[PDB]
Design a protein around this ligand. Structure first.
Ligand SMILES: [K+]
Ligand SMILES: [K+]
Ligand SMILES: [Mg+2]
Ligand SMILES: [Mg+2]
Ligand SMILES: [Mg+2]
Ligand SMILES: [Mg+2]
Ligand SMILES: [Mg+2]
Ligand SMILES: [Mg+2]
Ligand SMILES: [Mg+2]
Ligand SMILES: [Mg+2]
Ligand SMILES: [Mg+2]
Ligand SMILES: [Mg+2]
Ligand SMILES: [Mg+2]
Length: 235
RNA sequence: CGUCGUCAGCUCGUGCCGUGAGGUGUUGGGUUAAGUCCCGCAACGAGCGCAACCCCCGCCGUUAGUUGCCAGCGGUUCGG
């Protein structure tokens, strides 16, 4: 909540090409063939975005974090592994929201196989199944790791790159689910309800924004949590 | 019942795409006898198939000696 001057590395955008003209309002200028985000409008939108986040958090709402850019995977896997908001990390399966019932059936199979490997029924029905179901539970935990926490449809979603995760954005629009997103120059701002005009490539921007967001979430529900152990993931 | 044909296929549920017939899934890369499996993917699963569970032939054991053997000894019209 004090990220005014500590925003080191967020103003960096993508190149001159691969941009979206609809983002021109959130751009300050172009330095050395690279779009640089407007520093003022960044916090201008951050006010309203974080205010919506606090309102939805203190009401007890669930937010789905979505990240697949391979630069925010290890960060989302723990910033959402804090206060119990679910997440999707490896890839966004088509129909996680519109076909939410079938994916919940997949989650049922996940916890069923978890109950099988907890019961003494592991050894019966010989080793063929002990390998098949082992690999099946492996991949189910690989994909539905954070998604298993959703019992109903989420009240909002959080996206790291709305261009790379455009399918989740589209499904959220279809179901009238608010779309919080960390938008860059390559993204369409109209599809994002609450926009965060920052960098989606640099690890520091993602760590800063997501850490402060989860800190605001836990601050809305009381019991301020220690700083997130995602700094060591700078590497 | 024969046949394409023991051929590797044909579909469905939900979601998504298209005004619509339809598509996606079932395409792709690797692999297999196989839509067999792996990886990827607006798809996620499922059914009839494939395969397996059935029978026979292959090695061994347990249970049982009106089939078998000087394996073992005795008798032998010396033919278990
Ligand atoms: K058209
Ligand atoms: K193939
Ligand atoms: Mg065959
Ligand atoms: Mg269909
Ligand atoms: Mg057409
Ligand atoms: Mg239609
Ligand atoms: Mg169809
Ligand atoms: Mg087809
Ligand atoms: Mg096709
Ligand atoms: Mg099959
Ligand atoms: Mg596929
Ligand atoms: Mg007899
Ligand atoms: Mg006998």
């Amino acid at each position: 909540t004090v990220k005014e001057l500590l925003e080191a590395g967020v103003h960096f955008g993508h190149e001159r090409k691969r941009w979206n003209p609809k983002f021109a309002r959130y751009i300050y200028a172009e330095r050395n063939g690279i779009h640089i985000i407007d520093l003022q409008k960044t916090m201008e939108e951050l006010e309203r975005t974080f205010r919506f986040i606090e309102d939805l958090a203190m009401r007890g709402g669930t937010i789905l974090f979505v990240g697949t850019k391979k630069q925010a995977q290890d960060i989302v896997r723990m910033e959402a592994e804090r206060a119990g908001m679910p997440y999707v990390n490896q890839r966004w399966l088509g129909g996680m929201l519109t076909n939410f019932k079938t994916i919940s059936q997949r989650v049922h199979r996940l916890e069923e196989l978890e109950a099988l490997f907890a019961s003494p029924e592991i050894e019966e029905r010989p080793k063929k199944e002990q390998v098949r179901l082992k690999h099946e539970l492996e991949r189910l935990q690989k994909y539905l790791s954070g998604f298993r926490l959703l019992k109903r449809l989420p009240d909002a979603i959080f996206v790291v790159d709305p261009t790379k995760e455009a399918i989740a954005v589209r499904e959220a629009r279809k179901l009238f689910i608010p779309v919080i997103a960390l938008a860059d120059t390559d993204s369409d701002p109209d599809l994002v309800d609450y926009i965060i005009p920052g960098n989606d490539d640099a690890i520091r921007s993602i760590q800063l924004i997501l850490s402060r967001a989860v800190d605001l979430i836990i601050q809305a529900r009381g019991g301020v949590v220690e700083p997130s152990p995602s700094y060591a993931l700078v590497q």
